[PDB]
Amino acid sequence: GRVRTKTVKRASKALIERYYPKLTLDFQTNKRLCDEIATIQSKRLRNKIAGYTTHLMKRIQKG
Amino acid sequence: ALISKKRKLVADGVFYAELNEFFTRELAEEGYSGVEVRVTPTKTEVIIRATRTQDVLGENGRRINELTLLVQKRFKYAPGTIVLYAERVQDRGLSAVAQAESMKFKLLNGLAIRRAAYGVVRYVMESGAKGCEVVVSGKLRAARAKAMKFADGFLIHSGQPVNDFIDTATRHVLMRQGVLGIKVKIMRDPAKSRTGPKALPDAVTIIEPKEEEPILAPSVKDY
Amino acid sequence: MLMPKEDRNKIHQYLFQEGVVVAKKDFNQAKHEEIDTKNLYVIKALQSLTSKGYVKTQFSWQYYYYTLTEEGVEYLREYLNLPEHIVPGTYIQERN
Amino acid sequence: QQQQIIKIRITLTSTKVKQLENVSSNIVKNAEQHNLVKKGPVRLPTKVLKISTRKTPNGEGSKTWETYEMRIHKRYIDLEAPVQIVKRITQITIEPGVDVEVVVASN
RNA sequence: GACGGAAGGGCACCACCAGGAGUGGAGCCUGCGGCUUAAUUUGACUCAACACGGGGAAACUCACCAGGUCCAGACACAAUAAGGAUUGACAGAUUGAGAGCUCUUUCUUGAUUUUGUGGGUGGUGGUGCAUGGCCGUUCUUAGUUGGUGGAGUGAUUUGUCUGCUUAAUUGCGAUAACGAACGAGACCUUAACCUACUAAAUAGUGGUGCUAGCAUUUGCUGGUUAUCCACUUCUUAGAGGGACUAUCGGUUUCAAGCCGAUGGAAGUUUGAGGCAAUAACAGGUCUGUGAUGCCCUUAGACGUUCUGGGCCGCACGCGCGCUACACUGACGGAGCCAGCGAGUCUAACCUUGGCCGAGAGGUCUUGGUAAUCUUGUGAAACUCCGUCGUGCUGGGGAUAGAGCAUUGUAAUUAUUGCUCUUCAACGAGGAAUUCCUAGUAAGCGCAAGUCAUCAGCUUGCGUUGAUUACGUCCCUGCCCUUUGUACACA
């Protein structure tokens, strides 16, 4: 009952346009590589957007 | 005497909300903009960093010598401590009283209900006011409904750290036909304030890398 | 109230020495510190010069901030009979 | 008697903990400048000063209950201090409303 | 647009279906009526008035019924005081107050204006249909909107959608729309994980300086108003990590889902909180503002003195509750738990004890303006072991009676408690009818708030902790599409 939210959905495509060829299936090193250099404002606004980056590139290999 | 640890910071307002009720009410024509409280022992730092700080000399003893001994002599601080000091306040977009007291001499003449309002506030609408809210009510026209809900700005609120950027004011005047209540809300910029968070979480900029490397028939390097 | 004026002029004595005329709030207490006359009937002549200026005014918190104005010379040439520029319009503290 | 190290209970308190930890830091860093022997920073519990009233100016409606409260932050320290480090403290480690006075003992 | 006893969608423990607590039965506080008293001041009467207005009201409060002195009449502008204005007055006749209230009445009395046409505006006086500020409700809700382009002469509309999901106008997907600014979501808290830290008795540790003793089964119960103090993890957080519906099978428009399982302190926006947008209610506050337009009044006052009924008076009505109908209970013994605090300032608040008396409590003392002392809040509810039985009772304590104390200049119409006399109703409670889905529903009890004294109240703090629905439109309530509308203080 807890589907995601819009201002982190749109924020990644100005962000993962930078660094597509990374961010693999194991979701630990990419998570801090999602937290890499950006001007973030908290930790779980970005762990959600890393889990956004986790789930939404893991399923490109579903076709 | 023998002050406890629960008797001066809950009792901050016995002196700090004493001055802030005083120069909201006594001679608030000055455009009051807070006092820089660094209370040294046996001295009292009055810093009315206001719009009319040419009145810190004045006659050098006409009204200042009153104000040495009015706030300081109603709770009866013992004399021999009080010092007065001032300096001009500036950057008049980022303060509620700056445009409020720019209306506290226009409420007799018959200016428009809007013309002075969105004109002076465009000192900061182009330099850091996104979403403001001004209501100038009372009874300007004898009817059933007496309220002008003036709306202006390019609205960004709210992420709940709201106190980082807000100004608030509410004023009154006793005219011929009842009170005229002027409450505003002026919105400072965290991007013009240069402090702490550059912006509440909307303004997140993303830098660009070097162009990513090829297969790179590589090298002979020995520095 | 019909009351002799050495009462008032011990309190106007307390004005020109530092610059205060301030009453407190109570009835039948009559002990304000540093203005040691009654708390209430000193007001009776304190508005009596207010009607033609001579003093400023605010109430708030019932604090009685009734302190003299710039025209505190010409009536105290005759009600205290003092030579001015002692607590008149140029009563310099030192320089502040 | 001047400059002995005789176990003194220097006590600090403030309102916001950003500047209270500031004041204690550049005094224990100024406990490095001549190396006061010390079992020092006592990270003491901070306080909650709750009031819980009805802020409404009339007795009507589905009634209201809030809180409004000061944060007493408070750092008792176990110093062992000399007579030199108490002097310049009224306008060092500065923040709005610096409050300090120390009893010169602990035992 | 608003409606409908029109469909359709959805969703609702401020409505149900399981439930777990039940209410209104009695009596009695505590309100609002009425009753009428000379007086029951006053607002609020629809969830959205009625244990509300801090409202547990002796005075203080207090706006009604009672009495009587200050005028507390700044004064714009000026008659009457100088062989006397204003009037306090001893003792007395009245008179709660020697209230010289009133008089019997001559001692005091001086430029300190008694006042004089008129004016301060005191007002807890009407006026929230004169108001601002403020507070609630529409709504525990997804609802707003510009920038452009599209249709329509124009009001407007489109974007915001027939699908599916969701706590969600959240997302996917369809697409004259595209890209967005809001609110919400997001964000943030907290009872938290961190023995890794800058870090230790006004605070908590294995040790043990001086080491009494049970016991020798060789280190234990220990203490030592500090002996070196041994030491930072428990106590406390400076920033940070750690969790981001985390992972695979099931079924999925392959998304948007969400579950079988589980690393884990944290898989249910972690549980619950926090500020919550456009537009407005003739919502409400003028009995909190010394901010109030006007009007009644302006000292013969609706200010303001000081004692009494009052808001506490009684067929009766309705609102919130508290003790209970006892025998997983009652009485008596044994053991014994919290956190919240708020505590004296030039005055007397919290207080273990000593000693006294059965208590109520009282005099010297114990520490504390406060992680010092209260207080280890050992309390109740609780665990264990002896005594009570089918009754209005070893449940119950309404009702009136006497006595002892405490607080207050001041207790009667009783401030409260204490010890005995009085010892009842009431037996699970009618067509009337609420709240609430995990340390939460429930059990019980301490701080604080008003606090001298007065909790059957209200916030919190806690100590012990099930349930079953696992969600939905018939009743009630709210938003959206479509139609109809002779309506717009709808």
From Swiss-Prot, chain A:
Q: Where in the cell is it found?
A: Cytoplasm
Q: Which residues form the signal peptide?
A: none
Give the family per the record. Answer: Belongs to the eukaryotic ribosomal protein eS17 family.
Q: What does this protein do?
A: Component of the ribosome, a large ribonucleoprotein complex responsible for the synthesis of proteins in the cell. The small ribosomal subunit (SSU) binds messenger RNAs (mRNAs) and translates the encoded message by selecting cognate aminoacyl-transfer RNA (tRNA) molecules. The large subunit (LSU) contains the ribosomal catalytic site termed the peptidyl transferase center (PTC), which catalyzes the formation of peptide bonds, thereby polymerizing the amino acids delivered by tRNAs into a polypeptide chain.
Miscellaneous comment as given in the Swiss-Prot or TrEMBL entry: Present with 30500 molecules/cell in log phase SD medium.
Whom does it interact with, and what assembly results? Component of the small ribosomal subunit (SSU). Mature yeast ribosomes consist of a small (40S) and a large (60S) subunit. The 40S small subunit contains 1 molecule of ribosomal RNA (18S rRNA) and 33 different proteins (encoded by 57 genes). The large 60S subunit contains 3 rRNA molecules (25S, 5.8S and 5S rRNA) and 46 different proteins (encoded by 81 genes).
Q: What is this protein called?
A: Small ribosomal subunit protein eS17B
Q: Which residues of the full protein are shown?
A: 2 to 64 of 136
Swiss-Prot record, chain B:
Q: Which residues carry this modification: Omega-N-methylarginine?
A: 144
**Which residues are modified to Phosphothreonine?**
42, 68
Which GO terms are recorded in the biological process aspect for this UniProt protein? Answer: cytoplasmic translation; maintenance of translational fidelity; nonfunctional rRNA decay; ribosomal small subunit export from nucleus; ribosomal subunit export from nucleus
Protein name per its UniProtKB record: Small ribosomal subunit protein uS3
Processing after translation: Ubiquitinated at Lys-210 in response to stalled ribosomes. Ubiquitination leads to activation of the No-Go Decay (NGD) pathway and degradation of non-functional 18S rRNA: first monoubiquitinated at Lys-210 by MAG2, followed by formation of 'Lys-63'-linked polyubiquitin chains on monoubiquitin by HEL2 and RSP5.
Keywords of the record: Cytoplasm, Isopeptide bond, Methylation, Phosphoprotein, Ribonucleoprotein, Ribosomal protein, RNA-binding, Ubl conjugation
One MF annotation (Gene Ontology) recorded for this entry: structural constituent of ribosome
Where, per the database record, does this protein carry Phosphoserine? 95, 127, 219
PANTHER family per the UniProt record, alphabetical: 30S/40S RIBOSOMAL PROTEIN S3, SMALL RIBOSOMAL SUBUNIT PROTEIN US3
Is Phosphoprotein found in the keyword set? yes
Q: Name one Pfam family in it.
A: KH_2
Q: Which gene is this protein's source?
A: RPS3
Look up what happens after changing residue 210 to R: Abolishes ubiquitination by HEL2
Q: Which domain of life is it from?
A: Eukaryota
Instruction: Cite the KH type-2 domain residue spans from the record.
Output: 19-90
GO annotation, cellular component aspect: 90S preribosome; cytoplasm; cytosol; cytosolic small ribosomal subunit; nucleus; preribosome, small subunit precursor
The protein's organism comes out as Saccharomyces cerevisiae (strain ATCC 204508 / S288c) (Baker's yeast)
Misc remark: Present with 146000 molecules/cell in log phase SD medium.
Swiss-Prot record, chain C:
Q: Keywords on this record?
A: Cytoplasm, Ribonucleoprotein, Ribosomal protein
Q: Identify a single GO molecular function assigned to this protein.
A: RNA binding
Cellular compartment(s): Cytoplasm
- Choose one Gene Ontology CC annotation of this protein and give it: cytosolic small ribosomal subunit
What InterPro entries does the database record attribute to this sequence?
Plectin_eS10_N, Ribosomal_eS10, WH-like_DNA-bd_sf, WH_DNA-bd_sf
* Pfam families noted in UniProt: S10_plectin
Its chief place of residence is: cytoplasm
Q: Which Gene3D superfamilies match?
A: Winged helix-like DNA-binding domain superfamily/Winged helix DNA-binding domain
Q: What are the GO BP annotations of this UniProt entry?
A: cellular response to amino acid starvation; cytoplasmic translation; positive regulation of protein kinase activity; ribosomal subunit export from nucleus
Which SUPFAM superfamilies has this protein been placed in?
Winged helix' DNA-binding domain
Q: How is it modified after translation?
A: The N-terminus is not modified.
Self-association and partners: Component of the small ribosomal subunit (SSU). Mature yeast ribosomes consist of a small (40S) and a large (60S) subunit. The 40S small subunit contains 1 molecule of ribosomal RNA (18S rRNA) and 33 different proteins (encoded by 57 genes). The large 60S subunit contains 3 rRNA molecules (25S, 5.8S and 5S rRNA) and 46 different proteins (encoded by 81 genes). eS10 interacts with GCN1 (via middle region); this interaction is direct and promotes GCN2 kinase activity.
Task: State the family it belongs to.
Answer: Belongs to the eukaryotic ribosomal protein eS10 family.
Q: What else is known?
A: Present with 54100 molecules/cell in log phase SD medium.
Q: What is this protein called?
A: Small ribosomal subunit protein eS10A
**Species annotation:** Saccharomyces cerevisiae (strain ATCC 204508 / S288c)
Q: Which gene encodes it?
A: RPS10A
Swiss-Prot record, chain D:
**What InterPro entries does the entry give?**
Ribosomal_uS10, Ribosomal_uS10_CS, Ribosomal_uS10_dom, Ribosomal_uS10_dom_sf, Ribosomal_uS10_euk/arc
Name any Gene Ontology BP term: maturation of SSU-rRNA from tricistronic rRNA transcript (SSU-rRNA, 5.8S rRNA, LSU-rRNA)
Q: Which SUPFAM superfamilies match?
A: Ribosomal protein S10 (SSF54999)
Q: Which GO terms describe its molecular function?
A: mRNA binding; structural constituent of ribosome
Query: What kind of modification does the protein receive after translation?
Result: N-terminally acetylated by acetyltransferase NatA. Also partially acetylated by NatC.
Q: Which UniProt keywords apply?
A: Acetylation, Cytoplasm, Isopeptide bond, Ribonucleoprotein, Ribosomal protein, Ubl conjugation
Record's subcellular location: Cytoplasm
- Sorted alphabetically, which Pfam families does this protein's record hold? Ribosomal_S10
| Gene Ontology cellular component list | cytoplasm; cytosol; cytosolic small ribosomal subunit
According to the UniProt entry, the cross-link of type Glycyl lysine isopeptide (Lys-Gly) (interchain with G-Cter in ubiquitin) is at: 7, 18, 87
Classification via PANTHER family:
30S RIBOSOMAL PROTEIN S10 FAMILY MEMBER
Instruction: Explain the purpose of this protein.
Output: Component of the ribosome, a large ribonucleoprotein complex responsible for the synthesis of proteins in the cell. The small ribosomal subunit (SSU) binds messenger RNAs (mRNAs) and translates the encoded message by selecting cognate aminoacyl-transfer RNA (tRNA) molecules. The large subunit (LSU) contains the ribosomal catalytic site termed the peptidyl transferase center (PTC), which catalyzes the formation of peptide bonds, thereby polymerizing the amino acids delivered by tRNAs into a polypeptide chain.
Q: Which family does it belong to?
A: Belongs to the universal ribosomal protein uS10 family.
**What name goes with this protein?**
Small ribosomal subunit protein uS10
Q: Which organism is it from?
A: Saccharomyces cerevisiae (strain ATCC 204508 / S288c)
